[PDB]
Amino acid sequence: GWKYFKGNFYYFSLIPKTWYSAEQFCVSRNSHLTSVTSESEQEFLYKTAGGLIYWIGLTKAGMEGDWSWVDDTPFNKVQSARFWIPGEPNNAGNNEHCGNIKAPSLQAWNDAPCDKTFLFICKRPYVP
Numbered sequence: 001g002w003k004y005f006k007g008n009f010y011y012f013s014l015i016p017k018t019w020y021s022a023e024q025f026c027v028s029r030n031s032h033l034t035s036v037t038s039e040s041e042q043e044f045l046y047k048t049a050g051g052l053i054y055w056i057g058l059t060k061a062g063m064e065g066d067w068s069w070v071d072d073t074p075f076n077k078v079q080s081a082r083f084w085i086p087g088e089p090n091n092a093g094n095n096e097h098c099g100n101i102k103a104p105s106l107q108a109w110n111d112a113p114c115d116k117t118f119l120f121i122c123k124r125p126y127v128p
């Protein structure tokens with residue numbers, strides 16, 4: 001069951017996977033792990049997550065370890081600053097190169113090891 005919000009459908013998984021296995025599941029359903037591009041979308045996502053941890057489309061790109069969205073939405077460092085949990089991203093064990101929705105708050109995101117298994121959220125555009 002996909003949920004609808006502002007022009008996109010979202011799949012909140014019932015089974016946990018690593019970040020990449022999650023992304024492949026999304027891709028098999030003509031989607032991607034979700035990007036987050038506004039306060040209203042962040043709010044929709046974290047509220048729907050209901051306090052459980054879900055992989056989202058956050059991952060590193062480039063030598064400098066810049067964050068990026070797997071669906072290729074340009075990542076806006078300034079506009080996204082308010083969406084991380086205070087203290088994140090912290091790159092623990094120098095091995096946290098993927099991101100999830102963790103806290104039920106506008107400040108929701110944590111960076112975690114890509115090989116950890118969590119539920120996940122796919123995002124699929126509706127094309128009229």
Ligand SMILES: OC[C@H]1O[C@H](O)[C@@H](O)[C@@H](O)[C@@H]1O
Nearest residue numbers: 088090092096110111112113
């Ligand atoms: O204390 C916060 C810290 O908790 C755990 O160690 C992990 O979830 C880290 O990703 C996170 O940064």
Ligand SMILES: [Ca+2]
Nearest residue numbers: 090091111112
């Ligand atoms: Ca972290």
